[PDB]
Amino acid sequence: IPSLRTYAEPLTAAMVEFYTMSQERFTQDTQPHYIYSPREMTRWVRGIFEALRPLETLPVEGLIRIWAHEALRLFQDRLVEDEERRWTDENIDTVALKHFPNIDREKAMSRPILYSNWLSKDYIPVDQEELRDYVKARLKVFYEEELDVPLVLFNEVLDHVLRIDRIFRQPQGHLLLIGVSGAGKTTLSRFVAWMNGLSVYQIKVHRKYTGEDFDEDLRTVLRRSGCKNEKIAFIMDESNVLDSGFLERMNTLLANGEVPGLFEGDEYATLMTQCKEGAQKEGLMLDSHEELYKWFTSQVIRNLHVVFTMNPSSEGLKDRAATSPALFNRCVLNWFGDWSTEALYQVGKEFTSKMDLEKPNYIVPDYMPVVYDKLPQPPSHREAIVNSCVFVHQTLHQANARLAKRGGRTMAITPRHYLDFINHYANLFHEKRSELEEQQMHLNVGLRKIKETVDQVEELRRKVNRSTALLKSLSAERERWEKTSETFKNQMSTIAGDCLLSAAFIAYAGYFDQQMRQNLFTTWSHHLQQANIQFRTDIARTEYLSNADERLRWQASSLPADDLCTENAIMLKRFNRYPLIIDPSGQATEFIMNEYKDRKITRTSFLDDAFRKNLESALRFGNPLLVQDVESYDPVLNPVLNREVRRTGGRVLITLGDQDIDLSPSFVIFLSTRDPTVEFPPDLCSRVTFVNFTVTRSSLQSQCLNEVLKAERPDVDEKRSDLLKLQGEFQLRLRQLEKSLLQALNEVKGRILDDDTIITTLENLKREAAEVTRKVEETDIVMQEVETVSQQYL
């Protein structure tokens, strides 16, 4: 550009200035990957030059902007914490202003310094909103292409996808993404690789996976890349490496661009022939061995990009650098980290953009606990609900820290947990709202019919005795019907906080013991009360989540009658990721076996060799599958756990290992083990919900009392058992007759003159009065006696 020549001598100085600071601030004494060398300045100049190649004319403002963008792509990514990031941004702007006193700061230094070559054909700056819209449309296309799993597009996603696209566009582009599992590293990498035409190829690690298998995988990918040239996004995960041999093979492949001796003997000759054919197709005439080998190595360097995804484990960074320096030398390091409060707030709003959270009369409290950094200080109801959601997710981290400091193992919190929490919140909101609205509709139409009946009886009074009798008997219920209709508005008011608390409980506190679950729920309730969020207190979570109808089936299905077991059954019922049962005793195993017995649930284990076949059978038949011995986890389950389905015009299709099989919608899979103190592979930590079937003090106390009453006083134990079951049958009948009354009352579109209605209502009232007679008598004269015998043995 023959107009920025005069800017050659300032620019350089500025870069050097900034570079020197990054050497004297981010030392390797803090983290092992904080090494800044002239290599960073080399890739800086290369990036600026590439951003200036196709472009024709550009003011000093554009040059400063490109320089700052490159410095952010070279000095703002490997950083781990946000304080260093803020320092880097402050000093980049400061040095730019110092070295260019006569500059338009706003034009050169905007906050979202973004660049892309998707919207335009030339690498140029792009506004955030247009990029968001474009990536939304492209992601909609991508869904139909692969991974129908939806994704939210917050500010961070856009930054990361731009960085990964930059790296994929380079000739030998190796990327190293460090972030918590489930944060989207793999799916973002696959998305951008699809955008760039790369054929993503990932190794299928399994229990038998050994060095020879990985060598064959390397042979496959290298044969595809070098000969039969095609770009490949070879994606590796820090768990997909088992042996150090894998690490050294990847080290030499990354650094050299070609692993020596991988193709030995016959493989060498076959590769030589294939390279010769590829050279003839391309046009190069090569015969010698080393010429073809160098051509193949160049092709592999040009058309093979390796993406290593690793977990930010302290003291594992230095070890991984020692065991393979290429990752820290020939790989650009992107620190995804964990989703910021901003990212969590954005995904919460985006998914709860359908919920009816608007409350015009929401009184803003004098004090509000601010968790989101950019929370509007006069927020509406939605901006307080999402704030409390991100507060709950931040509360899980504090709970994990408290458990770790004084206690045993803690399971890592991932963004997938937040996604499940939000999905549960939305689903529970729709379900509870629909049930309450339908109940109110039925109640209102029934009450209108009762008013019409009153009109009838009054206009006949102005054949009568039965009318007045049924009027009085029905008014005995009309009083509570009117109470419920009046409280309908109150129940609708508090449906937001209750669904929030229930979703947070059934999505997060699935691993903790009773004390920690109660403490978490109490903290959430205290915070919601601080934010003046309406929620019906004095209502147990287990009763709200599950009615008595399915509780009867569960108790009859060999499930202990206690709070924790009921909650665990609830979690087993409403689940997004397939469950994992952690029970010392085996009770949950036969509980699940009986519950899904009618569906022909099959028993299988990882250790069993036929495990694959049975699995395949289920995948093609839609029958429930329970898998034990989860400690020896088989990673072939990784797609089906993430629902890597593919719509084929009506059929969902799933790839297991290397073979692709159609999926049946009736397929449900369960995982379980008998070891409370056992460590699971990190890849399986975030792919499955956790339910802990621990022993409660009250649960054990009940078992002791029941057994001692069975042995010491068999007669009293028999009475206790026959009255408990009889009471449950009365409650079932009470719900049946009560609901049938309303159903029949809604169904009739005439009046009391109908012959069937009068007899139905009289028989129903008689039957419920008689049932109340038995209920009251058994709860008075026989339950008190049973209580006294159990009281002395308590």
Partner 1 sequence: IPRPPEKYALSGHRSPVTRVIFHPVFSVMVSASEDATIKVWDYETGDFERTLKGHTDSVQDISFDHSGKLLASCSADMTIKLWDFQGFECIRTMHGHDHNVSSVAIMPNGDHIVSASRDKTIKMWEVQTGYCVKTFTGHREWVRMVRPNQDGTLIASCSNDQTVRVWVVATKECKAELREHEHVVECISWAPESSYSSISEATGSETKKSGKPGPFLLSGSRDKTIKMWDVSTGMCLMTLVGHDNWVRGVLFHSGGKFILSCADDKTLRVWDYKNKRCMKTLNAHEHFVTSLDFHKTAPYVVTGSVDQTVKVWECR
Partner 2 sequence: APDVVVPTLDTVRHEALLYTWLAEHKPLVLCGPPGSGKTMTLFSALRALPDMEVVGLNFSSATTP
Ligand X SMILES: Nc1ncnc2c1ncn2[C@@H]1O[C@H](COP(=O)(O)OP(=O)(O)O)[C@@H](O)[C@H]1O
Residues flagged as binding site for ATP? 179-186
Q: Where is 732: in which H helix or E strand?
A: helix 714-747
Amino acid at 247: L
* In the complex, least distance from residue 330 CB atom to partner 1, rounded to whole angstroms: 24
* In the complex, least distance from residue 65 CB atom to partner 1, rounded to whole angstroms: 20
| Alpha-helix residue ranges (DSSP H) falling in 26-177 | 38-51, 60-75, 82-99, 105-108, 128-145, 155-169
Quick one: which segment of 38-46, 113-121, 157-165, 715-723 binds partner 2 (CB under 8 A)?
38-46
Contacts of 344 (CB under 8 A, 6+ apart): 389, 390, 393, 415, 418
* In the complex, least distance from residue 641 CB atom to ligand X, rounded to whole angstroms: 9
- Between 113 and 152, how does the x/- string for binding to ligand X read (CB under 6 A)? ------------------------------------x-xx
CB 507 within 8 A of CB 417: yes
Residue 353 burial by CB count (10 A; 0-12/13-18/19+): exposed, middle or buried? exposed
Question: Binding to partner 1 by residue 137, rule CB under 8 A?
Answer: yes
Question: Binding to partner 1 by residue 121, rule CB under 8 A?
Answer: yes
Which one among 230, 267, 383, 631 touches partner 1, defined by CB under 8 A?
Answer: 230
Between residues 14 and 178, which has the closer beta carbon with respect to ligand X? 178
Contacts of 22 (CB under 8 A, 6+ apart): 36, 40, 75, 88
* In the complex, least distance from residue 43 CB atom to ligand X, rounded to whole angstroms: 7
| Positions of E strands within 209-367 | 233-237, 305-310, 332-337
Question: Binding to ligand X by residue 757, rule CB under 6 A?
Answer: no
Site for ligand X in 620-659 (CB under 6 A): 642
Residue 37 has φ and ψ, to the nearest 5°, of -125, 170
Which one, of 443, 449, 441, 444, lies nearest residue 470 by Cα? Answer: 449
Which one among 101, 265, 360, 408 touches partner 1, defined by CB under 8 A?
Answer: 360
Between residues 28 and 698, which has the closer beta carbon with respect to partner 2? 28
Residue 165 DSSP SS3: helix
Q: Which does 187 bind (CB under 5 to 8 A by kind): partner 2, partner 1, ligand X, none?
A: ligand X
* In the complex, least distance from residue 41 CB atom to partner 2, rounded to whole angstroms: 9
- Furthest-apart CA pair in the chain: how many Å? 116
Length of the chain: 794
> Please, what sign has the CA dihedral across residues 40, 42, 44, 50?
negative
Task: Provide the b/e sequence for 261-271 (b: ≥16 CB within 10 Å).
Answer: ebbeeeeeeeb
Which one among 25, 206, 294, 430 touches partner 1, defined by CB under 8 A?
Answer: 430
Quick one: which segment of 27-35, 118-126, 589-597, 691-699 binds partner 1 (CB under 8 A)?
118-126
Amino acid at 144: E
- Between 250 and 289, how does the x/- string for binding to partner 2 read (CB under 8 A)? -xx--xx---------------------------------
Question: Binding to ligand X by residue 416, rule CB under 6 A?
Answer: yes
244-256 helix and 211-225 helix, angle to the nearest 10 degrees: 20
Q: Report the C-alpha gap between 223 and 232 in whole angstroms.
A: 11
Q: Which two tokens stand for residue 164?
A: 């990964």
If you ran DSSP here, which 8-state letter would residue 176 be given? Answer: E
Question: Binding to partner 1 by residue 358, rule CB under 8 A?
Answer: yes
Which one among 50, 61, 148, 248 touches partner 2, defined by CB under 8 A?
Answer: 248
Site for ligand X in 180-199 (CB under 6 A): 181-187
Question: Binding to partner 1 by residue 649, rule CB under 8 A?
Answer: yes
Residues that bind partner 1 (CB under 8 A): 118-121, 137, 196-197, 230, 354, 356, 358, 360, 430, 434, 437-438, 440-441, 444-445, 648-650
Residues that bind ligand X (CB under 6 A): 38-39, 42, 149, 151-152, 157, 181-187, 309, 416, 419, 642
Residues that bind partner 2 (CB under 8 A): 35-40, 244, 247-248, 251-252, 255-256, 322-326, 329
